Design a protein around this ligand. Structure first.
Ligand SMILES: OC[C@H]1O[C@H](OC[C@H]2O[C@H](OC[C@H]3O[C@H](O)[C@@H](O)[C@@H](O[C@H]4O[C@H](CO)[C@@H](O)[C@H](O)[C@@H]4O)[C@@H]3O)[C@@H](O)[C@@H](O)[C@@H]2O)[C@@H](O)[C@@H](O)[C@@H]1O
Ligand SMILES: OC[C@H]1O[C@H](OC[C@H]2O[C@H](OC[C@H]3O[C@H](O)[C@@H](O)[C@@H](O[C@H]4O[C@H](CO)[C@@H](O)[C@H](O)[C@@H]4O)[C@@H]3O)[C@@H](O)[C@@H](O)[C@@H]2O)[C@@H](O)[C@@H](O)[C@@H]1O
Ligand SMILES: OC[C@H]1O[C@H](OC[C@H]2O[C@H](OC[C@H]3O[C@H](O)[C@@H](O)[C@@H](O[C@H]4O[C@H](CO)[C@@H](O)[C@H](O)[C@@H]4O)[C@@H]3O)[C@@H](O)[C@@H](O)[C@@H]2O)[C@@H](O)[C@@H](O)[C@@H]1O
Ligand SMILES: OC[C@H]1O[C@H](OC[C@H]2O[C@H](O)[C@@H](O)[C@@H](O[C@H]3O[C@H](CO)[C@@H](O)[C@H](O)[C@@H]3O)[C@@H]2O)[C@@H](O)[C@@H](O)[C@@H]1O
Ligand SMILES: OC[C@H]1O[C@H](OC[C@H]2O[C@H](O)[C@@H](O)[C@@H](O)[C@@H]2O)[C@@H](O)[C@@H](O)[C@@H]1O
Ligand SMILES: OC[C@H]1O[C@H](OC[C@H]2O[C@H](O)[C@@H](O)[C@@H](O)[C@@H]2O)[C@@H](O)[C@@H](O)[C@@H]1O
Ligand code: MAN
Ligand code: MAN
Lengths: 139, 140, 140, 140, 140, 140, 140
């Protein structure tokens, strides 16, 4: 492959999705989450030179964050909070970039992964009412 | 063309505004906000070698901040606080420059965007009583 | 001119003043302020190779600060606290230099400007009992 | 040898395990632990160019962490908390990498080892219900 | 001159004094101060290649500090706390050097000057029971 | 010698020990200590290219720490806590390395030495039930 | 001649001492102090290539510290706490070296000197039951 797949974390209780394109790398990503359930519910992604917004999950959270990524801007730090198991969920995401930008979405009360780093090219996982999530990098 | 448009965040309300100058960049930017409503209400911009103030929104807030930007000075840090959805609003702004200058206006209690960075060229959105909606605009 | 004029912030009131000297920069600046009114009241300036003290405003404040500036020393950070509107005032000033010197005068409870930076050449505004209005002036 | 062996710390108990491959260095490692027992209970490891998960221990902890390691990324900081002696246990691990990444699992209430550093090639020890014992293994 | 004169701050009272020598620069300086009155009371200075101690003021303070200055060591930070006006006093001093030495004497409850910096060549002012007034003097 | 001997600190009691190997430096060192007596009780050392464990003192403490030292890794910071006098003891050790590793064993409630630094080659002292006395030994 | 004498601080009492070696420098220095009296009581010094201990004062303190100094290692920061006047005493010492080593002895409740810096060559002063007085001595 021309890609590196981060471990997808939390569970199998959703519906599979893969957002990647030759169109290029991620230019913006949004996380929607709730104080009520302390979960990620909904993610949206836009790629370089492509105005289609690829969404998954139910946008029912009372909070969202957007990170915008310059074309030459990499992820140098990355943490996903989650509930472990087969009935697992993604609870939170923390990203830090080569340009000193960072975002913090949701909660981090149980399990954590510190992922591979590099140029963010896509996301894979499963979502229904809630977000499983794995990041995808270049080389 | 020459420009990177940050996502306009906030609601669909307000009177539209697009303040940009060809071969010009922002030299000063003012945010007006209220403790009462925890909203941005009014913004003004000046461009390089031009004393005319491009204003939008109702200057009814009890606080304002100005950032002045040297001609060679870029935005390296940029956050807009807002309320999401169709009846959304801009609540706050945080900017930091390549020369270590920063400003903070308003509140950050719901949604955040961490925008593109670079040389600030314009702003676009909608405003009436409030800043309903705001997107920053950079060069490349 | 060979000069950059920072936004004058504060009200329209007071008697106008402009302290500048042809190719000679500020080497000392004093701010006088009160706890009672939380305002700047009085400012003095001295220029390079000139022993005249240029003053404005009523020195009725219970506090003063002086910054002295080496000939090769620039302002890298600069904030003026003020009350906005026609009935406005300067409440405070914060300066930081290329040599890690800083001063803090007065209060910052309402509005702020983060100004242009560079070599401080002069100041302009209006004052009577109070500093109604203040803007800094720099070189290139 | 091609390899540097950290001291195995903890007890003599559990079923012995060695996770190493001629086909690669470690690309991912997971620690599972409990607040209830203040122990490590379960570990999993994957190597470069090999899709098998090598697991040991009972995944009965209420917490897990995963660290993923870029191919060119080394361990610069490394600490294992444990209870000493024959009936000992591993209680905690702290890892920090050449790329500023770190993870922290479990507790550090008794004994500590600060290990050799370098490229992590695998782990050795014993586990049953808990991680009785752990030793890290590096290249040169 | 080949000298830079920092503003003398404090009152106009006290016996006048000038401690400078062509013999050379300040090698040691002492400040004496009181908790009771929150004032500087007494100063002593020694120069390079000169064994005289030049003293002024009444050594009635319950605290003293000495800074000793290597021949090649400059002042990079300098603050004098004082009470402004005719009946003013020096209350405090903070010095920091090119070698990361600093001293702190006395109190800072009213007015401040952040002085010119450089090689400390002497001091002038007025003292009696108190240091009513102080101004530093530097080289070029 | 090709060796620098740190001062042995502690009492004159216990059985004497010297752990050194010709052209072989310390690769691992363990300290054992008790909360009950706030003393070091037992130390073990291993050298480069040699699988023997050289121990001294009674391993009766409820805590141990191990430091492993990469072949090219030096001590840049070093403290031994002790009780002074003829019936003195070692209470604690604090080491920091050229690779940012640091360890802390035992207690620091009485006397301290900040030792020579460099490549740790050996240790000398005395021990019985306790570590009576300890001195580090370095290369050049 | 070859030497810089720091100001001796403290009182006039005690038995005089001057510990200096031609073509030598201090390799170890010990301070003894008491919580009871908050004074330094006793000091010992060893010089390069010489095993003899030069002592002064009564070792009656409940605490001691030793600093060991590599032959190429200087003092970059140095502070002596003391009680001023004829019946004065040394209360405390803080030393920091060109290798980031530091020690702290005793108390700093009254007066301070920040001394000259450089290569520590000797000490001079007076002591009986206490260190009445101490001055450091450096190389040119
Ligand atoms: O930026 C936010 C918003 O700005 C604009 O909409 C703001 C504002 O628009 C209208 O103006 C306010 C007044 O509208 C009418 O005159 C009337 O509805 C007024 O109601 C007042 O007076 C009546 C009668 O006495 C009272 O019954 C009421 O209680 C009020 O005291 C309004 O004050 C209104 O539609 C108002 O509701 C609205 O906030 C637009 O640009 C919009 O797109 C922006 O989102
Ligand atoms: O990593 C820790 C440990 O892992 C392994 O040993 C784990 C545990 O394995 C055994 O499991 C526990 C039970 O074993 C026996 O079936 C029985 O003794 C159980 O006890 C319950 O039931 C009996 C019968 O009614 C009663 O006697 C009891 O009161 C209990 O209600 C045990 O708990 C044992 O081998 C146990 O001691 C051991 O810790 C090994 O890999 C070991 O090497 C590691 O230390
Ligand atoms: O560095 C400090 C100090 O050290 C030296 O001073 C020590 C001490 O020297 C003298 O000796 C102390 C004793 O003096 C007399 O023998 C006697 O007066 C002793 O007092 C105890 O017992 C008497 C009689 O029982 C009682 O009257 C007392 O209350 C005591 O219980 C003293 O302890 C004295 O000159 C004393 O004042 C002095 O400090 C010198 O180096 C000195 O220069 C230094 O300042
Ligand atoms: O400059 C230091 C100090 O010098 C002078 O000292 C003040 C003393 O000077 C005079 O002797 C008087 O002002 C004296 O006043 C005390 O006794 C007085 C009776 O003579 C009485 O009326 C006063 O209330 C007071 O008890 C001062 O002590 C002078 O220049 C000072 O103001 C100056 O600070
Ligand atoms: O800076 C404040 C103002 O200075 C002048 O007048 C104001 C003053 O009038 C009276 O002399 C006093 O009682 C004051 O209390 C009062 O501020 C003018 O120059 C004015 O317009 C300025 O705003
Ligand atoms: O290493 C410290 C000392 O260890 C032993 O002394 C400990 C105890 O030994 C016996 O229990 C009694 O003598 C006790 O009084 C004593 O504390 C000896 O090895 C001694 O030499 C060591 O200094
Ligand atoms: O979020 C978990 C979720 O699982 C799927 O997405 C659906 O089957 C939901 O109705 C259930 O509520
Ligand atoms: O310094 C306090 C006091 O001292 C005396 C005289 O020198 C006065 O002039 C002064 O007010």
């Amino acid at each position: 492959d021309n890609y590196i797949y981060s471990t997808e974390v939390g569970g199998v209780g959703g519906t599979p999705f893969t957002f990647m394109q030759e169109s290029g790398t991620i230019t913006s990503i949004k996380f929607n989450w709730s104080d009520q359930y302390k979960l990620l519910h909904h993610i949206e992604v836009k790629f370089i030179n492509n105005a289609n917004i690829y969404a998954t999950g139910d946008p029912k959270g009372n909070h969202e964050v957007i990170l915008e990524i310059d074309d030459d801007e990499t992820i140098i730090g990355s943490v996903i909070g989650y509930k472990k198991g087969n009935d697992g969920r993604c609870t939170g995401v923390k990203l830090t970039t080569s340009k000193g930008k960072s975002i913090m979405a949701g909660y981090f009360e149980e399990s954590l992964i510190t992922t591979y780093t590099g140029k963010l090219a896509g996301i894979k996982g499963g979502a229904g009412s809630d977000i499983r999530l794995g990041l995808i990098f270049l080389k």
